[PDB]
Amino acid sequence: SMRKKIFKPEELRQALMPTLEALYRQDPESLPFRQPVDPQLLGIPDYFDIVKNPMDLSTIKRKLDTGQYQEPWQYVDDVWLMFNNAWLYNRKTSRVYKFCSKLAEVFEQEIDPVMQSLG
Ligand SMILES: CN1Cc2ccccc2NC1=O
Ligand SMILES: [K+]
After folding, report:
1. Which of 23, 29, 33, 90 to mutate to test the pocket of ligand 1 (most atoms within 8 A of CB)?
2. Range of the domain at 36
3. In the chain, which end has fewer C-beta atoms inside a 10 angstrom radius, N or C?
């Protein structure tokens, strides 16, 4: 037989939310990622020409809090979208690129045992 695993939204929140919280706890590194990029406010007006699909911690949080992920990989893909956006837009030598790299490191550490537990 073949049975597709079903994940209830609270199941996903309780497993995955802690991994998001681990990123929020990183200070100063998470501060640029805690709200959607506002190009006008930040003085970076080319941002949306380069980044077509914006993502940030508050959006991911919202989606986890309101049951918008069906599968663990959907949550993971949004986290990587947020990081890949920042690695794409910002220069390798920049503060925000280096902050992104630190958050990705923390994320890789936290997510692996969670993915194993979710199966
Ligand atoms: C996620 N952010 C936020 C940000 C804040 C300040 C300067 C550059 C950026 N670029 C980004 O990619
Ligand atoms: K880049």
Report:
1. 90
2. 1-119
3. N
